[PDB]
Amino acid sequence: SQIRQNYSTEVEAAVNRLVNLHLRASYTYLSLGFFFDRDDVALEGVGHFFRELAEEKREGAERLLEFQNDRGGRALFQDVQKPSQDEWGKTQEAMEAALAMEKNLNQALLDLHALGSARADPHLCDFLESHYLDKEVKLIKKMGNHLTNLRRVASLGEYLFERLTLKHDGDIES
Amino acid sequence: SQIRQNYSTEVEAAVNRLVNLHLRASYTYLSLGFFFDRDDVALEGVGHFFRELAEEKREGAERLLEFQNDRGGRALFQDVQKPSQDEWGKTQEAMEAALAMEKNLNQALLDLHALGSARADPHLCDFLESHYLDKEVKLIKKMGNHLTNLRRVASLGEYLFERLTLKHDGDIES
Amino acid sequence: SQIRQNYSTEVEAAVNRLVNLHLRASYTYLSLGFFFDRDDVALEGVGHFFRELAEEKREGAERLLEFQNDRGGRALFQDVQKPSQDEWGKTQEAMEAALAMEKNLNQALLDLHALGSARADPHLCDFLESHYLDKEVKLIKKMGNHLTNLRRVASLGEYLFERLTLKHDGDIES
Amino acid sequence: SQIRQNYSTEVEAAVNRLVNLHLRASYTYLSLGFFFDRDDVALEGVGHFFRELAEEKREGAERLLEFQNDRGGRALFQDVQKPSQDEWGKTQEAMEAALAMEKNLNQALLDLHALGSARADPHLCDFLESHYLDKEVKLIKKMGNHLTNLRRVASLGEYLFERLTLKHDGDIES
Amino acid sequence: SQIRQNYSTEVEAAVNRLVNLHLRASYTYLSLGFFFDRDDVALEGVGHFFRELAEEKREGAERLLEFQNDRGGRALFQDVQKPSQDEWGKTQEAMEAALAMEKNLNQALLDLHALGSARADPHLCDFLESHYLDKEVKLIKKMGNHLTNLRRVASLGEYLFERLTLKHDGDIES
Amino acid sequence: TSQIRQNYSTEVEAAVNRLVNLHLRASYTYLSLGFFFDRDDVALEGVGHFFRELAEEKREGAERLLEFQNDRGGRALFQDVQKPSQDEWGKTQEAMEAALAMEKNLNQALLDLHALGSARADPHLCDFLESHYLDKEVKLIKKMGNHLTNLRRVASLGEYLFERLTLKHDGDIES
Amino acid sequence: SQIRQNYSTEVEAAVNRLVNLHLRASYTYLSLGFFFDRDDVALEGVGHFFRELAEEKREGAERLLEFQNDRGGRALFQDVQKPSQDEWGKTQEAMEAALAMEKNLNQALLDLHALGSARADPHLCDFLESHYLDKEVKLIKKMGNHLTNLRRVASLGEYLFERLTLKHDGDIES
Ligand SMILES: [Fe+3]
Ligand SMILES: [Fe+3]
Ligand SMILES: [Fe+3]
Ligand SMILES: [Fe+3]
């Protein structure tokens, strides 16, 4: 690693378990994503929402892996834990189960900035800030808004929420 | 000054407190619009509605200052009072609080016309007519229609109203 | 709130008073902006300059509120006090008054970034040093350059400056 | 009528009978217009002229009803009195009967403005001035000019007039 | 009436009172449609629906006059009765008031075709069959479908019906 | 007595007639003021074009009063248009001052006519004056006042720069 | 039903058996059509001809059902009778069988128009006249012409006819 410079091994190991955090997160989003496409639920909108969330997480993890080899470090891959559940009931707990993941995923992330801000790594204070932290802050507010809307309609409102909110904006957001 | 002509100080001072009336009005509208973007409410439709009404008011006040210096008058700026409240409960009171703002605002305009119409100022008597009073009538009617609809659905109706009326007519009333 | 996480109240109170700082700042430039389009001054260029600056400040204040309700906090609105003065004399003092009003704004921003760097808020570091602190440094240099040019021409030069510098740039800059 | 404001009933009752004045006016022009496309007359130009005038009056009456519900008023519909005649003879008296219908219509409008101008309704001032009163003054002059031309040619000239004046500008005003 | 041929006065008088049937029908439809754009109701969709039905009727009538003078007859105009009611409660009775008023219109048309078919007028067969009876049948079916849907949702259903059926199909049919 | 005449008195019909001629004298002084600056001894093309276009704005104003007239049934007559106020206008600073003096007098006659009609209750006069004339006059007085405030500040080198950098620049793009 | 008007059951029952006549008619036609693209016959032209005729008949039957539910009546579906044959030999008999099946269809339609014209239903007169009876007359003449041509060539001519008449026009008579 002739390129390695100002990259502590105490932080190098953190992004590795952070990588796998994003991997596990996308893994549970994918499972959440397909549970809602099942016939027993038949909510196309929420399924697409969570599968797109898994896309985002899987692209984030692959970004921490190129940030790694960019910063000279060598990364390893612990196994990816199965999702924290197997059937997610209705959408209202599923979003809270999901919002619980982001706050955790945003929590484990702020630690990495706090870690590097202590070890005085500015490139990390730029890369996290730029890519990850703003996206995480914007993502919690999205699931927060969706939860506030779900509680309002709460299962007729559970049906209308998918059509009038998740499917509409989901088609026009991306 | 040199251009000043048929512009009395008895009316010149009125538009000054009318200027600040619009400034205060947009100030309550801005705070109303951001209150509805909070996670606790999460009503994007009403939020955008009020946040774009605040800009109509701010452009109204800035029109009164373009009218002022046109008539040679000199306008001073009293401070802008904080809004009426700080958190506005649910949209049905917020639209009621808002419709209460217009009728008060439309009242000051009728007052200013009656002032100049008695004091024989034509330029005002048919610049207000043109730029302000018709807009105010249309705005009161729009907010009244929204209130009548809100009471009908009245909180599932609160969510459906946003989705199926405010967001739609906001996208197509850009 | 649900979304609120790693967002203090010691800083939540600061962005609230920074919101109102920006609000007053626009209120300063607005009045400064219209004074210069008055007949007694008749400087179209400086008037447009300061009105566009008020546009910028108002768009900034509205950016701290969409950062606030996003970061979880609940923001309140103290009243916006009237500008500093009421008749700004010559453009050389008004730009000096403005540059004086501007630097104080950059000072509050530096204070807020220091507060966040102490309380270890990285998302605030990103958001500020991206959207606000860079725009501020460029703004002081612009008013600084204008002041250096005004001193040079210093009222024929006051006429030419607005004519050959403010108006030309104002058309082509935006 | 939560929107109702500065809208009297002494005037609200007038716009209601003005609505029916316009309705009967179109009913006058409709029957006057089909009489002229009858075989016994066979004047296509005058028929189209009066049918378009009936269309204009119907669009006017529908404008006083959209002005009504704008001002919160409630409008009731008295029956529409049949036209003042049944066999209009020839174009020279028919234009005279028509010009008699306009001056009466313009008279009711002047009365309605004088009413609101007394009761100090500026929105009605604006609305009448803008839409109705300028259209009326200009419409009387059109029928006035047509009558002056009809007298000149006065039935060969009656054939040419409709052929060479009404039909030409009719397509030009189409 | 040199053109008159196979046109009896026993049927000529029928289309005359059939004209006024359409005129009254549009007159009831017009008032029904403006009542629904009032603030107390604030149903834009049903208002537009009935206001466009009024114009469909008003163009139906103006066709009976274009059919009349074509077939040689001379048509007179009795006065147009004010509508049935003056305020129409809510949507469900207003559509029933309409469908009940609509069926009567189709009833008079069947009477006129029976009259002409007994009196052996084939041009009336063609004209009615093509231009009128098919339209009245389609209109009765549309009003019936709307009534069934209204009863299904029957006032949240009254709001949702407007938004999700009347406004949509009115914009896309037009 | 005309068929179309309605709610149009002679106390106003005579006013718009002398108002017509006011605009005619106004274009006349503006025309002569405009060509004076085209002369070699002044050679200010910017101010010349400014005033020559002001003259056409006034002339189009006067023809609005005449077609407002015959629209409102009245019959209008034409008193002669007396020569402009002056014959040589010296410097632009007096010429703009003489001009701003012509507007305020002209805006005054309009306010007078509308006060006359508003008392006699002619709403069509409201609609026509307030719309086509009074707003234009307010903005014209403001434009000439701005030009005057600029002229005094830059005050004959500044008399030259004002024409190039202000009158001619916008004169091209504001027209 | 609510919409039902001037629609008797003595005729409502007829269109129901006419629906099934068309259904069996198409069922006859498609079976006649696939027999002709069999290997033992190998006449693609006649096969396409009869399959397109089955398309037409099926579109007709669906037009009597959209006429039915439109006239308020309720329609039931008797079972569709197997075609009148299973192996149609040569094209000359199959066209004769078809023209025999066709004329019977026109006969039922003439019966239905006679029924309605006696029972004085003008809407059925219009609907049948317009859509069905004119298409039926043109269809017999087409199969009549084809039969006359088949007799002329009558199996070389059976090959050429399909090749030179049915296929050529069939492509350009899509
Ligand atoms: Fe006006
Ligand atoms: Fe940083
Ligand atoms: Fe027939
Ligand atoms: Fe007025």
* DSSP codes, C35-81: HTTSTTT--HHHHHHHHHHHHHHHHHHHHHHHHHHHHT-------B-
Interior/surface letters A123-135, b for 16+ CB within 10 angstroms, e for the rest: ebbebbbeebbbe
In this structure, what token pair is assigned to residue B42? 């999460």
Residue type, C125: C
Nearest by CB: B163 against A145, A148, A164: A164
Q: Are E43 and E37 in contact (CB under 8 A)?
A: yes
Ligand 1 midpoint to CA D130 (Å): 6
Q: Are A130 and C142 in contact (CB under 8 A)?
A: no
Ligand 4 midpoint to CA B122 (Å): 7
Whose CA is closest to C58, among F26, A50, B22, B26? B26
In this structure, what token pair is assigned to residue G116? 């309605």
Three-state DSSP at G171 gives: helix
Q: Are F155 and F94 in contact (CB under 8 A)?
A: no
Per-state percent for chain B, helix, strand, coil, to nearest 5: 75, 0, 25
Angle at G53 between CA G47 and CA G58, to 5 degrees: 125
- Contact (CB<8Å) D70/B138: yes
In this structure, what token pair is assigned to residue B24? 């205060």
Measured over the CA atoms of residue F148, residue F150, residue F156 and residue F159, the dihedral's sign is: negative
Looking up tokens 């036209």 gives D83
- Contact (CB<8Å) B160/A161: no
Q: Are B32 and B88 in contact (CB under 8 A)?
A: yes
Whose CA is closest to C90, among C52, C129, C35? C35
Ligand 1 midpoint to CA F123 (Å): 10
- Contact (CB<8Å) D83/E77: yes
| Strand partners of residue C80 | B80
In this structure, what token pair is assigned to residue B77? 């700026």
Whose CA is closest to F22, among F67, F84, F96, F115? F84
Neighbours, chain F (3 or more CB pairs < 8 A): B, C, D
As a whole number of Å, the CA-based R_g of chain D is 18
- Contact (CB<8Å) B5/F139: no
Q: Are D140 and D102 in contact (CB under 8 A)?
A: yes
CA within 13 Å, CB half, G2 = 19
Q: Are D61 and D106 in contact (CB under 8 A)?
A: no
- Contact (CB<8Å) D122/B113: yes
Whose CA is closest to B41, among A107, E57, A145? A145
Q: Are F64 and F117 in contact (CB under 8 A)?
A: no
**Which residues, including other chains, have CB under 8 Å from residue C106's CB and lie 6 or more apart?**
C133, C136, C137, C140
Resolution (A): 3.3
> How far is the CA of C164 from the CAs of A102, A132, E15, F26, F118, in angstroms?
54, 46, 78, 34, 47
B102 is in an annotated binding site: yes
Could you give phi then psi for residue G123, rounded to 5 degrees? -65, -40
Nearest by CB: B164 against E39, E42, E163: E163
Q: Are E19 and D58 in contact (CB under 8 A)?
A: no
d(CA E48, CA E52): 6
Mark residue B4 as left, alpha or beta (left: phi above 0; alpha: psi -120 to 50; beta: remaining): beta
A and B: number of Cβ contacts within 8 A: 33
Method used to solve the structure: cryo-EM
Three-state DSSP at B80 gives: strand
Please state at what angle helix F92-120 crosses helix F45-71, rounded to 10 degrees: 10
Q: Are A146 and A165 in contact (CB under 8 A)?
A: yes
Ligand 4 midpoint to CA B134 (Å): 13
d(CA C149, CA C136): 20
